[PDB]
Amino acid sequence: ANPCCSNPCQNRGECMSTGFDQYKCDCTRTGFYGENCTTPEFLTRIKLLLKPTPNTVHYILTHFKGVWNIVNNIPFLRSLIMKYVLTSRSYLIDSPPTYNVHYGYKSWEAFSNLSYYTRALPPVADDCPTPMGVKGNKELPDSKEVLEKVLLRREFIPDPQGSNMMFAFFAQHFTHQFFKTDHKRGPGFTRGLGHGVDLNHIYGETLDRQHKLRLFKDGKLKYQVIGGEVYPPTVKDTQVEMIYPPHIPENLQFAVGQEVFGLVPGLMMYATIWLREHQRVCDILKQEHPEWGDEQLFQTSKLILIGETIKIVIEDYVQHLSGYHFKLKFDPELLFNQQFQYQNRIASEFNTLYHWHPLLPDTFNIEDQEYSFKQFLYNNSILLEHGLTQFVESFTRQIAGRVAGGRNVPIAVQAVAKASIDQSREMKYQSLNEYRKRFSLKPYTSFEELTGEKEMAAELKALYSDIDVMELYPALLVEKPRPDAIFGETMVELGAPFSLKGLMGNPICSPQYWKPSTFGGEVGFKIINTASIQSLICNNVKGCPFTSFNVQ
Amino acid sequence: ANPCCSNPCQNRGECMSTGFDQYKCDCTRTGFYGENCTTPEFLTRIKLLLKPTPNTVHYILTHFKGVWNIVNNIPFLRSLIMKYVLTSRSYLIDSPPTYNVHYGYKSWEAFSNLSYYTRALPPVADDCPTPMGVKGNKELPDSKEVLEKVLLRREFIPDPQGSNMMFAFFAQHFTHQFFKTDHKRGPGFTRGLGHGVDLNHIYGETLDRQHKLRLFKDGKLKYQVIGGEVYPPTVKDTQVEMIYPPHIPENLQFAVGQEVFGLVPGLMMYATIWLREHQRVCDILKQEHPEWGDEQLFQTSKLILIGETIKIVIEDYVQHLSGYHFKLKFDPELLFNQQFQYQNRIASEFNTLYHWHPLLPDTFNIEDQEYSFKQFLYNNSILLEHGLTQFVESFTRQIAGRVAGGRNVPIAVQAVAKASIDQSREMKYQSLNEYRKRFSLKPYTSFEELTGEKEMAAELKALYSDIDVMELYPALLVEKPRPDAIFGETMVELGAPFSLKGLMGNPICSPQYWKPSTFGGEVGFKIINTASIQSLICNNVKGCPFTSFNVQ
Ligand code: HEM
Ligand code: HEM
Ligand SMILES: NS(=O)(=O)c1ccc(-n2nc(C(F)(F)F)cc2-c2ccc(Br)cc2)cc1
Ligand SMILES: NS(=O)(=O)c1ccc(-n2nc(C(F)(F)F)cc2-c2ccc(Br)cc2)cc1
Ligand SMILES: *[C@@H]1O[C@H](CO)[C@@H](O)[C@H](O)[C@H]1NC(C)=O
Ligand SMILES: *[C@@H]1O[C@H](CO)[C@@H](O)[C@H](O)[C@H]1NC(C)=O
Ligand SMILES: *[C@@H]1O[C@H](CO)[C@@H](O)[C@H](O)[C@H]1NC(C)=O
Ligand SMILES: *[C@@H]1O[C@H](CO)[C@@H](O)[C@H](O)[C@H]1NC(C)=O
Ligand SMILES: *[C@@H]1O[C@H](CO)[C@@H](O)[C@H](O)[C@H]1NC(C)=O
Ligand SMILES: *[C@@H]1O[C@H](CO)[C@@H](O)[C@H](O)[C@H]1NC(C)=O
């Protein structure tokens, strides 16, 4: 019924019904006029034939290593390169946020309610003829059919970028502070009201919890020592609820903060690492401010870790995951002379694309051993037994899967991947193509173009028929990998804008927060500006095991 | 004990202990260096001897009416004038917010916790020798002594600006959506998590309430009709809790939304006006979108009213209250090419200065009658009897007090005014002077300079002794009124920055919200761009009573 079901407003115009069987587009500040916001204004023309493609740019970044090893050394030049990368993507996200699971129109409720994940593109009018508006059939491909045919892994496909387990587990631990779906409420709801890098996964979603986890001495986090090593406190000492099956030893039930990190030794490995870092910085602070009381030591430390987290994720993580030759930089001071909103709301679409289950191996080899998922999941032992050292070692050495390949989802994780396909369906999402145009990408004209091959392409066409009905999630796991890389064009273009906003748009990166003072002196500030995934391990893991997010 | 108790960091540097009896200032981006951020950088010098004073500017605004009646007609020129007024003050507020009741240091908790009012200047170290840090005595002047001697009204002092009751009641109704102190938690806490112009006073703080107040038909708000006139629903029909003494008739207990607006016929007057406006726009929308369902009609309407509210508050309210000759303008598009944070957190200091009880008359004359507070407070009748018409008439005609005069607080309200004095004391505030330098004002050198007279000046000196110990609240109600105006310099300079942020920094003023679409077409957009305190009354009050925030 609803006239905008056909998604007729191009170039970002907005669409509203005007009388049952009529609509109108709002090309306000699109740069295009006319009925559907298509005919561009002169200046738009001028810049359009000038805009290099994300690909015809990704080349540049990955190439000319020599040139980059010049720019990368002219601090003047570097920050200049990084400011652009930092700025350009930003125009793709709405701040303040707009639509949500239940509002295809703006509303105050959408904006107000922090319990919802935001949404880069409105849902599909619940009264539209087809699941993507008007295109396609009454129903959409059997997800199970789609799962098996193109997603499920056959032979393990390694990652062409060398992304080890340190990476795969880091990303799962990190992103799980903001992606926290309130399954009681539904897909669309989140329990991460902090909507960003707030280290809630470490400290607690609530003050209640946060206190349950606290030592209240030296500003330190509560903890236990098993065999001379520091591990999280128990779910019986602190009284913080955790998700552990009944067949789990008291001493096994680690507390930590994020209620779910106990179900996978990968998680709890990093948990114990940060839990050590907190305490570490606490010491670095106490004897820098012997006169400080508990709270400040705590609250300050929590601030510095949010700094580190961001510095690592931008300088190690993203650096690797991009394969760019240009050396990314975390420098709040680059956005200062720039328009920018120091606020963030996490979108469903960002949660979705981040379902990188493919990264997961077939087994978890902690060198001199091999575990089936069945036995890795929520196990006390494995960590206690191997310890952080021979775990950091065993994992730096272990390649991960490839996301944008095709057929790489471990069968174990198959239930999940399906859910992802049939949940995004729940949240009435739009076509892979609508999301592509939404992010300045040209629509795919054939599944064949999408995959860049035809075995799968021809299969998808069996299922969908119109490429303009290919779903966003599957497409991301299938799509032709950018050169010798792990992701496709879409996966990179939607997610980068989202990723940098939630990183840069964090209060501590605002001009009134970014200063020696906010963190307890020049000291705790440097801790933030000299952080690296390596230092994090060297400092908090027994012998300094060398590490990298790359398989060496 | 704490070394920063002496508030030694000038020009906005930050201060932290460095060892029990030692501190350090952070002049980061102050423009001043040296131990206490006092010696300025060249450019600072350059701009300082160029910076015209708020007074040596307020003159300009109020004067040359001829010139202004030229600028005011050159749309090019006008918006150009308004952009500056809009921008200049902005640099005085922190976004994102920083300190709070319990944090004199930044912390994440300060930033995260929406239950706290923000705070333009940190509290005083609970371990400082005196109430203002180091200056003054172990204790501070008996508040009661101070109240009586300089605050309590003797002979009613009218307002030199002609601010009628329409103004006084409007401001009390309006600002009571954001100022909502959580007295259960304490001074410092708020129940207005929306921290701004969200019309929660109309729709409800929670969805639960919002739903109890809703018709769920045509998008309309629930309501009753007593004698052919539209008044809010009953606390028995809707089940929304309100504050009414037991000796209050069923039909008297109006619902409305803000749980306290029932205790004063002034409030409920405006309550009934907006409740009518909502419904009004709902109609203007339904036959513009016959195909819309309830929710959108509701949600859209709520969006339009937040527009109106802001348009009025900027173009009538502030315009009047400023006496400026320049015609203020509500134009979101002026901040577009400007750096600006579309977010807001309400500070204690803003709540405080806004305690304009002086505005209140000695009696409430609803023409051909006169009421003592005792009988105006929480009365069904008065409104039901006189009606909105002979209430709007009776109030346009009725001058209000003068805030920055001295001795003008009605004795009735004396309890309140005292509290204000001894609550701000609870929230360990800083000197009137620290708040002055904080907002770029020069410190007063004598109570005599403060008041601009000596009867009160000499009395205050009896009580305080050091001018640098004069409290912020009292000073605001005492201070020499700017010319033939209602406020002092402080009252204008602290509050303007606060006032424009919470107005401009509202999502609906962001480039992606400010468009014909967000409000249901060009129609409901014009409703926002043609709003005025007059139209509001003409449209929703029986015969169009003329109105003004000025006593004519
Ligand atoms: C350690 C092995 C892993 C297992 C067994 C696993 C299992 C799951 C399960 C059961 C869910 C929730 C099911 C649902 O979507 O309704 C989930 C969600 C998710 N997983 Fe994994 N996962 C693993 C590793 C990873 C990794 C390495 C990543 C990559 C970042 C990842 C990213 C996600 C994301 C983004 C979600 C959604 C989070 C949310 O909405 O709460 N997972 N995973
Ligand atoms: C209708 C008569 C009025 C009465 C009887 C009254 C009464 C009160 C009371 C009892 C309080 C709370 C006491 C406290 O501070 O702890 C209060 C707060 C306040 N009043 Fe009034 N008031 C009236 C009119 C006004 C007017 C016209 C203004 C001018 C804008 C005003 C502005 C304020 C402000 C800003 C607060 C603080 C709001 C908050 O923190 O929640 N009042 N008033
Ligand atoms: N080797 S690749 O083509 O697959 C590839 C190329 C570029 C990127 N990239 N670059 C950046 C930055 F440098 F701008 F920060 C951020 C991301 C990024 C980070 C997280 C997500 Br989720 C999505 C994108 C990532 C992968
Ligand atoms: N006649 S006066 O000297 O007392 C006077 C002069 C200027 C102002 N003024 N100007 C502006 C604006 F135009 F910039 F918006 C806002 C305010 C304002 C609004 C609310 C509060 Br609370 C405080 C200030 C107010 C009074
Ligand atoms: C606008 O788009 C609609 C739906 O996509 C289509 O029917 C119409 O022909 C288009 N008109 C123009 C002028 O682009
Ligand atoms: C957000 O929306 C959900 C569902 O609409 C509701 O249950 C929840 O109470 C809302 N949150 C708030 C703070 O109103
Ligand atoms: C737990 O880990 C141990 C040690 O690696 C392993 O032998 C065992 O299979 C696991 N226990 C369970 C119940 O899976
Ligand atoms: C800085 O202020 C402190 C405390 O008010 C004082 O001891 C010191 O002499 C001042 N120094 C300068 C350079 O202003
Ligand atoms: C805010 O802080 C107060 C005191 O620290 C606490 O009691 C309250 O629960 C906090 N609010 C939230 C939403 O955490
Ligand atoms: C309520 O208002 C009426 C009408 O103005 C007045 O006569 C009466 O005194 C008030 N009633 C009470 C109980 O105060």
UniProtKB/Swiss-Prot annotation, chains A, B:
Q: Which intervals hold domain EGF-like? A: 1-38
The note on the cofactor says:
Binds 1 heme b (iron(II)-protoporphyrin IX) group per subunit.
> Known consequence of changing residue 548 to A?
Decreases acetylation by SPHK1
Top-rank taxon: Eukaryota
Major subcellular location class: membrane
The topology of this chain with respect to the membrane is: Peripheral membrane protein
Q: What is its EC number?
A: 1.14.99.1
Q: Which GO terms describe its cellular component?
A: cytoplasm; cytosol; endoplasmic reticulum membrane; neuron projection; nuclear inner membrane; nuclear outer membrane
The entry marks the following residues as binding substrate, namely 89, 324
Where is it localised? Microsome membrane; Endoplasmic reticulum membrane; Nucleus inner membrane; Nucleus outer membrane
Q: What induces it?
A: By cytokines and mitogens.
UniProt protein name: Prostaglandin G/H synthase 2
Q: How is the polypeptide modified once translated? A: S-nitrosylation by NOS2 (iNOS) activates enzyme activity. S-nitrosylation may take place on different Cys residues in addition to Cys-509.
GO annotations under biological process? Answer: bone mineralization; brown fat cell differentiation; cellular response to fluid shear stress; cellular response to hypoxia; cellular response to non-ionic osmotic stress; cyclooxygenase pathway; decidualization; embryo implantation
Which residues are marked as site: Aspirin-acetylated serine?
499
Its family remark reads: Belongs to the prostaglandin G/H synthase family.
Q: What is the effect of changing residue 357 to Y?
A: Impairs peroxidase and cyclooxygenase activities toward 2-arachidonoyl glycerol
